[PDB]
Design a protein around this nucleic acid. Structure first.
Lengths: 135, 165, 154, 111
RNA sequence: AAAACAGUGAAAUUGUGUGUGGACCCGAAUGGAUCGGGCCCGUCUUGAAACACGGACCAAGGAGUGCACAUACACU
């Protein structure tokens, strides 16, 4: 869509290139199909990952948490709020400097048209703008 | 207040973010680079980078911070008037006695290039003029004309910093 | 209706498919594998030689402990076989496509076997009695078949 | 053919060296830094005069990028070898290759 | 004992086509050979990679609960 928050425009690329792409897969989820990828802490008496031997993978923890300012920020430099009514946009009228709107999936075509018309006149960014309404 | 905002929005006071943005910008700002002192009008120099590398040329002026202006000899070695980063020049102890009337500007010689300029060569009045000045200082001198024609070659048998230029 | 397993134009092609056939799965795919990309008249000629024990079907995937044979050298291997029951069925199936080709107004020549595939059909259950008062399975493994032939652009 | 010309241009103006290892202990490797030897430089005092200089790895058979740039950061050991940093990490397949030393200094940010 | 809708139609497992590798995971890369680190989990045990036991594969089900009687804490 190629849009950016004006307050961060000259900084956003540093921020984006700085985000981690680490994944914390569950131990041995690569060995048997019955174990999903979702993280669970290992609790075995012998387990090599719990005991932190070199060569085993890394475990999650507080050290990896991002700085408080950068956290929750989308790649366009805004935070997101969910909307499903015309009367919801009315809340964003004070916050449009830092927040943007994302219309919920279940809202149908006829109603979406009414949301977008209101978004234009109030000056609010909607990130699902194209959505289903491309046809 | 409407229920969408009383929960989601609560994560951060985002009014603080401008202060963070400034501090981050400061930290990743480039360091300064020093303008050199060692070069005098009419010094011969050797080009180290880009399409004209290996040739001797004559230094004319500082231009735009680290940018400097040089002339080849379109008759002798075919190189015209150009601009380059002043660090891409190796100094040598020969100085010609040229003095110029006015400031002039030319295309930059970027470090990354795709293709050679084998053809399409022409000259301006100022290129003509400056050649017809430089040439006078060169004609009177013994082997100087040939000196400008042979490319430079680094000695492959001794450490560079042992040699003098 | 039937969704054939790939996309080729209705003009310039001829097709057939069958379900739950009562020829043996593993034998049938070794037959189909070797006649892929072959010209239709060549295919019918080759399969006639297999019925007479003059040429063989080579084996590559379902092939453990199989016999070695001088006829396999034509395909750069030692191992081959003569599965008569599967060959008779495939031969009939291919001959019918030449009827369709002629009737449709393509030539009887320049047709090439572009697609052919075999799939497993559901098992038919049976039993055998063993020693010490046991009963063990004795099932049958049928198959499904598709073919598409196209005219060479040349 | 531009490749044949770009080589001869570089050959006339640079010193030559070879890439031989990453920075490593007996057990672990640190692939962000690489070790180079320069042709006729054979003491630590001689090698100090190159700290700060630009280096280039040129690879004509590459489909992505024809050359990688870097900088010499420090001397290593007592027999004139050095440590350098490049814009991208050097692959183990690229060890043994020829490197060019460029006779001008650059800043750590430029690479 | 099993067996609901002539709905939707996951995983194990099979064939065909197209790509990438020779058990696989983590860290770092190339146009391209690869480099460094890692023994199979759960469990009793002073001590498990064990020549200790359980585990062929996938789905679904599957184990600190309710009442009575004294009790210490927090809240009214």
């Amino acid at each position: 869509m190629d849009i950016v928050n004006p307050s961060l425009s000259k900084v956003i690329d540093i921020i984006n290139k700085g985000k981690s792409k680490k994944q914390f897969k569950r131990f041995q989820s690569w060995r048997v199909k019955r174990v999903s990828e979702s993280w669970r802490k290992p609790r075995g008496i012998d387990n090599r990952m719990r005991r932190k031997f070199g060569g085993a993978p890394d475990m999650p923890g507080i050290g990896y948490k991002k700085p408080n300012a950068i956290r929750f920020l989308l790649p366009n430099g805004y935070r997101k709020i969910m909307v499903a009514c015309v009367k919801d946009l009315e809340a964003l009228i004070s916050l449009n400097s830092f927040y943007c709107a994302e219309i919920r999936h279940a809202v149908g075509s006829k109603k979406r048209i009414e949301i977008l018309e209101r978004a234009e006149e109030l000056g609010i960014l909607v990130i699902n703008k194209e959505g289903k309404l491309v046809k | 207040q409407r229920l969408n905002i009383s929960n989601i929005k609560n994560y951060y006071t985002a009014d603080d973010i401008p202060a963070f943005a400034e501090k981050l910008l400061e930290l990743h700002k480039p360091a300064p680079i020093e303008l050199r002192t060692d070069l005098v009008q009419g010094n011969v120099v050797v080009v180290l980078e880009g399409e004209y590398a290996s040739y001797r040329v004559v230094y004319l002026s500082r231009t735009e911070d680290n940018k400097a202006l040089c002339m080849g000899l379109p008759s002798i070695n075919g190189i015209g008037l150009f601009e380059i980063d002043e660090r891409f020049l190796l100094r040598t102890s020969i100085v010609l006695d040229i003095r110029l009337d006015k400031k002039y500007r030319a295309k930059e010689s970027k470090r990354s290039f795709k293709k050679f300029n084998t053809k399409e060569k022409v000259l301006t009045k100022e290129e003509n003029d400056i050649e017809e000045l430089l040439l006078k200082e060169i004609e009177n001198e013994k082997f100087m004309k040939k000196y400008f024609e042979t490319p430079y070659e680094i000695n492959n048998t001794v450490d560079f910093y042992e040699i003098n230029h | 209706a039937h969704k054939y397993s790939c996309d080729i134009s209705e003009a310039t092609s001829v097709r057939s498919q069958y379900n739950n056939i009562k020829i043996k799965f593993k034998n049938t795919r070794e037959v189909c594998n070797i006649i892929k990309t072959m010209e239709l008249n060549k295919a019918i000629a080759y399969l006639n030689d297999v019925l007479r024990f003059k040429k063989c079907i080579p084996v590559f995937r379902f092939a453990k402990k199989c016999g070695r044979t001088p006829q396999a050298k034509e395909f750069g291997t030692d191992k081959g076989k003569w599965p008569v029951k599967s060959v008779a069925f495939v031969k009939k199936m291919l001959e019918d496509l030449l009827v369709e080709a002629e009737k449709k107004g393509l030539g009887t020549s320049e047709l090439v076997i572009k697609h052919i595939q075999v799939n497993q059909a559901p098992k038919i259950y049976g039993r055998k009695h063993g020693a010490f008062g046991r009963i063990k399975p004795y099932n049958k493994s049928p198959s499904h078949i598709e073919v598409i032939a196209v005219k060479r652009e040349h | 053919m531009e490749v044949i010309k770009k080589i001869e241009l570089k050959e006339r103006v640079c010193a030559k060296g070879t890439l031989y290892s990453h920075k490593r202990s007996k057990k672990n490797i640190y692939p962000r830094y690489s070790l180079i030897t320069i042709e006729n430089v054979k003491t630590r005092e001689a090698a100090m005069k190159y700290v700060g200089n630009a280096v280039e790895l040129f690879k004509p058979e590459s489909t992505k990028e024809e050359s990688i740039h870097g900088i010499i950061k420090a001397v290593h050991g007592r027999s004139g070898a050095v440590r350098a940093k490049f814009s991208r990490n050097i692959s183990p397949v690229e060890m043994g290759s020829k490197v060019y030393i460029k006779l001008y200094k650059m800043n750590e940010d430029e690479i």
